[PDB]
Design a protein around this ligand. Structure first.
Ligand SMILES: CCCCCC(=O)OC[C@H](COP(=O)(O)OC[C@H](N)C(=O)O)OC(=O)CCCCC
Ligand SMILES: CCCCCC(=O)OC[C@H](COP(=O)(O)OC[C@H](N)C(=O)O)OC(=O)CCCCC
Ligand SMILES: [Ca+2]
Ligand SMILES: [Ca+2]
Ligand SMILES: [Ca+2]
Ligand SMILES: [Ca+2]
Ligand SMILES: [Ca+2]
Ligand SMILES: [Ca+2]
Ligand SMILES: [Ca+2]
Ligand SMILES: [Ca+2]
Ligand SMILES: [Ca+2]
Length: 1533
């Protein structure tokens, strides 16, 4: 349907999202993982390439590969940072290839690739996978392609989740050009370009020497830097100097750091920093434009302008946080000229050149116009009392105008008169303005670029209305209001109407000649993009329905962020307005309002959102002091009227104020109606009464060491504060308290007071012993205003309770269920008000408090697991008190916790009045206490079940088609070296195909899960749930504890909440018994020994834990008392180990059920480092209805690779599942069929054993029934298949970032049942031994290297060098064919290359020490590549390299029949020669071209080699032996 709602349905407008901690400059743990896989087509002669990987300033190196232009590394690097996102995304990832690097000489560079971290982070999975970095010479614009480096680059923040692909076998002919390391839309060939950063002049610089300043401008771009000259002793410097960078276009480093700095001999320091975003000043595609900026001003912000010997906020001058003061304004320019690299006229140097720019006038930035800024401080409350009782001023400044202390007709009044604060409460002051509101007015002069601010105002007006609508949709989804899809269609209609309005509005004032090129280009880009946004919104409106509303709501966030991106004007016009609180002339706290928000326009859409309005500001501490413990308290709270505009437009600059004031003006302004006042004296005043219905809170912050709090809420309104009562030892208080703010005085008749009420600040505190209180959080509210003429009638009144999101810093700290109403005391006094019905404490009145219905809460008490020590004492007699809304039940005593942590009474219950609205249900508190002697109960831990919606019983859907249970439905269905790795790799390929299908048979398979097994079976919580007990104070979001180390135990059990008068037929269909209640089918609680068999397959992408960038992983398993540490079987120097292990641990379930599988880096000296660990919780797996004990294989077999692991046969599993589910069956008739309930399965009736005779069996059709157990009518359930799950490895020391992926699975077998056999042989495949024999027969047309000293005869002493594993382990040389005059050599020399080989990986396996000083042997896997080189032997100098070919033993070209048919096209990029594998044909003889790169970096034919490659196995080589060189057996001529 197309009908829609165009108005706000919910009350999200009354729940503001004010946060005192911004996201600007907040550091966060980041990790860049770069896997250098290989390189190809590297440009060099006999090069030993080393790939250097730099991220930021840290650089790491691969190992050196000898004499190859296509090296293979497969090396993993991890770079760790703790920086803000803007600093992080500006870091340069530089993947270089160098050679000849050693201990005192830096390497010669071959080629480099650059990008920044933000380009990788803007990818769909924050990563590139298997992409080729285009290397280029960074010092030569005329040089060509220097090679490619295949690599993975991934960026993760703390808490990000990446769908990382599994590393399968890489046996493919990979296309380099279709898989380049470039973002989408960047062309594969990138030109060179010059980035002219023209630096004209600066104004308004602060004091830096002690007292002049000597500024220069340093520009950073893509890792390069260049600076202008120093303009000594000038606050208005004039450079007219351009800094020219030579870099590739389009650049993958998309930000430029322009920074004015002061020149000192000792203390060269930053003044201000601006970042030019190249995304905002350019566009790609056909209708795009080159990056252009200016000539236009740019505003720089940073620390306070007063000079100190050391600066606390010097990081603000470097641009690392939000600037708290105006530093300077820099007149700026940017142009990009694409260089013609084929021209030999211009120089090919890439060095940063600082040249003289062409000077342009000041009138090019717009004519200077007079601007008038007016402020009216209506209210100044909530002032931090730690600043003292000294008098308080508020200084407003804009640029340097109004800065009478630090900055450098009408006289501007920039500060309020000083006024002593009065006490609101123990934490807060307020300034007693009352009727006398102090005012400020500032004259300033800025260039007239109001059109930029107007267009930004229209775009941000559309974005503001869009975000308000999407917040309305999200909130009314959360509160379950009817028809959320109708509101979203109205939001999209309103968005498309705003986008159409922008096109009609933004094309005014194009006749100004002061438009820059960027103004015209970004105007065209904004019109095009908002027209496409309007059409896309009209298209997305028709697709919004009931079931699709959440994903379309997600898709509208793209429109929102694109509007926020386009609304940011990169050419600054008017600097932001700063409001500073002062006492003893000390700058205490600041707010910063953008000047486009205050700008005045005739057009409503061009008008700023805060212009001519009373703006609620919250001042905050500058710099890092505004975060953490210091930034918790509200520094000040202002109701500041603000107006900015032209001085010609100030006729109506008082129109937004509340009416009923007299203007008191300065002495020079007497008798002038246009003169602004220095104060307003209000004569009208309206009496009001605020009712704070503080009913409840939930999920609050824990500010005591017991894990609880003593919360009371302090409600702030205007200058008054009132407290609720303190409720002890709870994180979900039911205060149930009405706070009445009597006879409030609202000065003046505020315009639209119903639609914009004054804000209410609610602060939660934990009461402590000595009168002090811990801050717990802060929410904001807006009251529902009743005017005097309004009736207190539905649907508006009485107000309903709603959840207000409490924030403690940036972290969420619970919800406050409250309602607020602001009732006007009318002409008839307080008799017009509604009546008011524990001492003087008033309850929340009827009609606002929730209507209560009776519920029964039944608790299953299953057990208590891993109860940690309290006060250094072991928990011995635990008891689980459960309390919900005052009522509750207590569990039976566990008389001895160690021998039996079971409850004697399984199911208890209690009755409690809960709200009829299930969204208003209070949380249920699980509390575990230890019963010491003499009634001394100490708290062990507590868990808060925040939502009971999961545990609410409703009668099940028996109208479902599965329940019908009647009518028959029929469901129908070399080799010897296959092992478990065959089915594993087949399942990996199948999982890859299913991941490709979700994005858009010879070998039996298992189910590889990309995540945990818990993620596919809702954590196995079908009947049994986990409730983590918590103790201790909740940690802060920076330098604090996470929730996991507050866990002091687990409570096992379930809940079942239902309304007390059940229907009798509903109760009987649920099978209600008096002993177990609603919990039917509960398994036995008795202890049972379980054999836990943990198969550890492999680990991928382990975090390095040694100084060499690798680790030595082994598996350490904890389960109960068993602590296996397999440090004898560590895999040395490997970050992607293949363990292939199994571990048998007998554990006493359900007590010893927390399984910890960890990976530890073995260290020779010192303790072994933890890499990561995972927790599996096998109890939920063991007792699940999903049968997560042993995985169910796809097919049944009794031999081979697909052998059935389970000691229970499929017929036994089917019989047990039918017996426990009370299903008739399994009825085996003939061996091919079985009937289970109404459903009939058919399949094969016979099974083959190891020797292949046939035997009739029921197991195939029983397994067919088990595979379709989900389709069973009564108790049908999806059984857990045979699987390999991928579990992330987590380190508590580096939280939030997954730093390994351990592929494993766990099989559990009860030991009262028959035991399983031996564990599966999942040990890694042994490499098949081979021997490659390479008979170098002859060489022809080898180039002549030597020149004779006497006659000048050209000759070569040709010998052939060959290896297969490497130069240092496998190299063999022929004897030298001395003095070849025509390039002909005769060798007949046989190489022998014995090697171990894995056929699936196509890798040669060898074991050798990494260095001569290394402790152990490391397993290496290289590609099978035979390298043949020709060399010239010299007696008195080094031998000279002549040419080489690298034959991949699976994909090398067929050798030519003669030497004349051998051409360069066999080895180069031509495809005309078919490829041949030596593992398939075993004998390839022919001629191959040997190539070398000349000084022009092109391949040339430097020789040909006749060779015979003969691949045999080792067993064939022993029975038919030959000798090395020409020796016996089988001698050569
Ligand atoms: C003197 C030569 C110093 C050479 C440099 C250096 O500090 O080496 C530390 C080495 C190796 O320790 P790790 O691999 O854990 O450090 C690596 C770390 N986990 C990381 O990955 O950052 O330890 C010792 O020498 C024994 C210390 C304890 C002795 C009781
Ligand atoms: C036993 C007495 C102390 C013996 C100390 C000793 O010599 O250890 C050998 C180590 C090398 O051993 P690994 O790198 O395999 O470290 C093993 C494992 N990967 C680990 O993490 O520790 O030598 C150096 O660190 C010096 C290199 C100098 C190069 C110039
Ligand atoms: Ca200086
Ligand atoms: Ca406390
Ligand atoms: Ca306390
Ligand atoms: Ca280590
Ligand atoms: Ca180690
Ligand atoms: Ca260590
Ligand atoms: Ca020579
Ligand atoms: Ca020679
Ligand atoms: Ca030589």
């Amino acid at each position: 349907s197309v009908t829609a709602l165009t108005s706000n349905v919910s009350n999200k407008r009354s729940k503001p999202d004010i946060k005192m901690e911004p996201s600007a400059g907040r550091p966060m743990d980041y990790q860049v993982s770069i896997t250098v896989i290989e390189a190809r087509q590297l440009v060099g002669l006999n090069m030993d390439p080393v790939v250097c990987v730099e991220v930021g300033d840290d650089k790491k190196y691969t190992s050196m590969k000898e004499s190859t232009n296509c090296p293979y590394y497969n090396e993993y690097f991890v770079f760790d940072f703790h920086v803000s996102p803007d600093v992080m995304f500006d870091k340069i990832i530089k993947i270089s290839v160098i050679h000849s690097k050693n201990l005192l000489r830096s390497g010669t560079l071959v080629g480099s690739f650059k990008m920044d971290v933000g380009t990788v982070y803007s990818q769909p999975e924050h990563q590139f996978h298997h992409k080729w970095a285009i290397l280029s010479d960074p010092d030569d614009i005329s040089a060509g392609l220097k090679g490619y480096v295949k690599c993975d680059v991934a960026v993760v923040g703390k808490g990000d989740n990446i769908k990382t692909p599994h590393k399968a076998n890489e046996t493919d002919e990979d296309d380099i050009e279709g898989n380049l390391l470039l973002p989408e839309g960047v062309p594969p060939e990138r030109q060179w370009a010059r980035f002219y950063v023209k630096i004209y002049r600066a104004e308004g610089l602060p004091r830096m020497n002690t007292d002049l300043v000597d500024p220069y401008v340093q520009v950073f771009f893509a890792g390069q830097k260049g600076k202008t000259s120093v303009q000594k002793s000038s606050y208005e410097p004039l450079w007219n100097e351009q800094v020219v960078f030579t870099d590739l276009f389009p650049p993958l480093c998309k930000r430029m750091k322009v920074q004015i700095r002061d020149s000192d001999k000792v203390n060269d320091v930053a003044i201000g920093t601006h970042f030019i975003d190249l995304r905002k000043i350019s566009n790609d595609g056909d209708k795009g434009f080159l990056p252009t900026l200016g000539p236009a001003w740019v505003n720089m912000y940073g620390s306070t302008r007063n000079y100190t010997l050391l600066d606390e906020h010097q990081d603000l001058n470097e641009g690392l946080g939000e600037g708290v003061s105006f530093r300077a304004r820099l007149m700026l320019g940017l142009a990009v000229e694409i260089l013609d690299t084929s021209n030999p006229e211009l120089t090919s140097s890439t060095e940063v050149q600082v040249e003289q720019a062409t000077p342009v006038s000041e009138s090019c930035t717009g004519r200077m116009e007079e601007f008038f800024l007016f402020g009216a401080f209506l209210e100044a409350s909530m002032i931090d009392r730690k600043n003292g009782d000294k008098p308080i001023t508020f200084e407003v400044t804009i640029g340097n105008y109004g800065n009478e202390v630090d900055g450098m007709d009408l006289a501007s009044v920039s500060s309020t008169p000083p006024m002593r604060p009065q006490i609101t409460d123990r934490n807060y002051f307020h300034l007693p303005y009352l009727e006398r509101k102090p005012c400020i007015y500032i004259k300033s002069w800025w260039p007239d670029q109001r059109r930029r601010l107007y267009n930004a105002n229209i775009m941000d007006h559309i974005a503001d209305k869009l975000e308000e609508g999407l917040n309305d949709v999200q909130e009314m989804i959360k509160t379950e209001k009817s028809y959320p899809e109708r509101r979203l269609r109205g939001v999209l209609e309103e968005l498309s109407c705003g986008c159409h309005r922008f096109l009609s509005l933004s094309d005014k004032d194009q006749g100004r000649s002061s438009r820059t090129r960027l103004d015209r280009e970004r105007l065209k880009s904004c019109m095009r993009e908002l027209e496409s946004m309007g059409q896309q919104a009209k298209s997305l409106r028709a697709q919004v329905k009931r079931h699709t509303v959440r994903d379309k709501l997600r898709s509208c966030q793209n429109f929102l962020q694109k509007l926020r991106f386009l609304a940011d004007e990169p050419q600054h016009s008017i600097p932001d307005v700063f409001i500073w609180m002062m006492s003893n002339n000390k700058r205490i706290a600041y707010a910063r309002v953008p000047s486009k928000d205050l700008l005045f326009s005739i057009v409503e859409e061009e008008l700023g959102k805060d212009c001519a309005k009373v703006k609620t500001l919250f001042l905050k501490l500058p710099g890092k002091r505004g975060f953490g413990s210091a930034g918790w308290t509200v520094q000040a709270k202002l109701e500041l009227y603000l107006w900015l505009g032209l001085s010609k437009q100030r006729k109506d600059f008082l129109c937004g104020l509340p009416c009923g004031f007299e203007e008191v003006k300065a002495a020079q302004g007497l008798g002038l109606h246009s003169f602004p006042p220095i104060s307003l004296v209000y004569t009208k005043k309206q009496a009001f009464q605020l009712r704070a219905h503080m009913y409840q809170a939930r999920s609050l912050f824990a500010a005591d060491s017991s894990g609880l709090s003593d919360p009371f809420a302090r409600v702030f309104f205007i200058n008054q504060s009132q407290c609720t009562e303190v409720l002890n030892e709870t994180l979900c208080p039911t205060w149930d308290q009405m706070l009445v703010f009597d006879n409030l005085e609202l000065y003046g008749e505020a315009h639209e007071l119903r639609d914009d009420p004054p804000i209410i600040v609610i602060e939660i505190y934990d009461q402590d012993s000595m009168g002090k209180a811990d801050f717990m959080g802060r929410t904001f509210a807006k009251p529902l205003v009743k005017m005097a003429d309004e009736a207190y009638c539905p649907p508006r009144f009485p107000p309903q309770l709603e959840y207000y999101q409490i924030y403690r810093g940036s972290a969420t700290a619970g919800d406050l269920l409250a309602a607020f109403e602001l009732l006007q005391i009318g002409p008839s006094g307080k008799a017009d008000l509604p009546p008011i019905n524990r001492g003087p404490i008033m309850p929340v009145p009827v009609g606002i408090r929730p209507v209560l219905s009776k519920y029964r809460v039944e608790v299953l008490f299953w057990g208590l697991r891993d109860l940690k020590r309290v006060n250094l004492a072991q928990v011995d007699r635990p008891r689980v008190d459960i309390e919900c809304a005052g009522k509750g039940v207590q569990s039976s005593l566990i008389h001895n916790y160690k021998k039996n942590p079971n409850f004697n009474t399984l199911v208890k219950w209690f009755e409690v009045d809960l709200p009829e609205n299930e969204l208003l249900h209070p949380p249920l508190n699980i509390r575990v206490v230890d019963c010491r002697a003499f009634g001394r109960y100490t708290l062990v831990g507590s868990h808060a079940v925040s939502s009971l919606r999961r545990f609410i019983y409703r009668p099940p859907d028996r109208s479902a088609p599965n329940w019908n249970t009647t009518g028959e439905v029929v469901v129908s269905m070399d080799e010897s070296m296959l092992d478990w790795w065959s089915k594993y790799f087949a399942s990996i390929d199948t999982m890859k195909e299913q991941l490709r299908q979700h994005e858009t048979a010879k070998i039996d398979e298992l189910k590889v899960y990309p995540k945990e097994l818990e993620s596919e079976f809702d954590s196995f919580e079908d009947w049994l749930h986990t409730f983590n007990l918590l103790r201790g104070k909740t940690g802060d979001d920076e330098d604090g504890s996470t929730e996991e180390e507050r866990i002091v135990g687990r409570f096992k059990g379930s809940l079942c909440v239902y309304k007390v008068p059940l229907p009798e037929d509903v109760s009987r269909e649920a099978g209600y018994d008096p002993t177990y209640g609603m919990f039917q089918g509960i398994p036995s609680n008795d202890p049972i020994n379980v054999l836990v068999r943990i198969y550890v397959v492999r680990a991928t992408d382990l975090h390095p834990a040694d100084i060499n960038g690798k680790a030595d992983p082994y598996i350490a398993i904890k389960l109960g008392k068993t602590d296996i540490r397999d440090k004898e079987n560590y895999i040395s120097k490997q970050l992607n180990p293949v363990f292939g292990k199994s571990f048998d641990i007998e554990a006493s379930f359900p007590m010893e059920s927390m399984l910890t599988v960890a990976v530890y880096d073995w260290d020779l000296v010192g303790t072994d480092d933890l890499i990561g660990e995972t927790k599996i919780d096998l109890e939920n797996r063991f007792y699940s209805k999903h049968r997560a004990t042993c995985g169910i294989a796809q097919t049944y077999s009794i031999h081979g690779y697909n052998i059935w692991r389970d000691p229970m046969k499929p017929s036994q599993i089917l019989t047990r599942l039918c017996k426990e589910g009370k299903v008739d069956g399994p009825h085996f008739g003939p061996h091919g069929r079985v009937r289970v309930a109404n459903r009939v399965f058919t399949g094969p009736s016979e099974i083959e054993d190891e020797n292949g005779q046939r035997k009739p069996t029921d197991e195939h059709v029983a397994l067919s029934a088990l595979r379709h157990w989900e389709d069973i009518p009564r108790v049908g359930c999806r059984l857990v298949p045979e699987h390999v799950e991928t579990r992330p490895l987590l380190n508590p020391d580096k939280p939030g970032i997954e730093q390994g992926r351990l592929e494993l699975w766990v099989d559990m077998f009860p030991m009262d049942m028959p035991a399983p056999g031996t564990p599966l042989d999942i040990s890694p495949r042994k490499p098949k031994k081979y021997e490659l024999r390479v008979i170098v027969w002859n060489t022809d047309e080898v180039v002549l290297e030597d020149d004779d000293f006497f006659t000048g005869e050209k000759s070569s002493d040709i010998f052939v060098r060959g290896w297969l594993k490497g130069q240092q382990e496998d190299k063999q040389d022929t004897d030298v064919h001395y003095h070849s005059l025509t390039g002909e050599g005769n060798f007949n020399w046989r190489y022998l290359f014995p090697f171990d080989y894995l056929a699936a990986e196509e890798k040669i396996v060898m074991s050798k020490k990494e260095s001569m000083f290394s402790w152990d042997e490391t397993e290496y896997k290289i590609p099978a590549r035979l390298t043949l080189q020709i060399w010239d032997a010299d007696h008195f100098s080094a031998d000279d390299f002549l040419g080489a070919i690298e034959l991949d033993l699976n994909r090398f070209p067929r050798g030519a029949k003669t030497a004349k048919q051998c051409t360069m096209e066999m080895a180069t990029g031509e495809v005309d020669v078919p490829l041949v594998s030596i593992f398939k044909q075993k004998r390839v003889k022919g001629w191959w071209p040997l190539l070398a790169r000349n000084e022009n970096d092109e391949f040339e034919l430097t020789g040909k080699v006749e060779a015979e490659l003969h691949l045999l196995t080792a067993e064939e080589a022993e029975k038919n032996p030959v000798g090395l060189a020409r020796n016996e057996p089988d001698p050569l001529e």
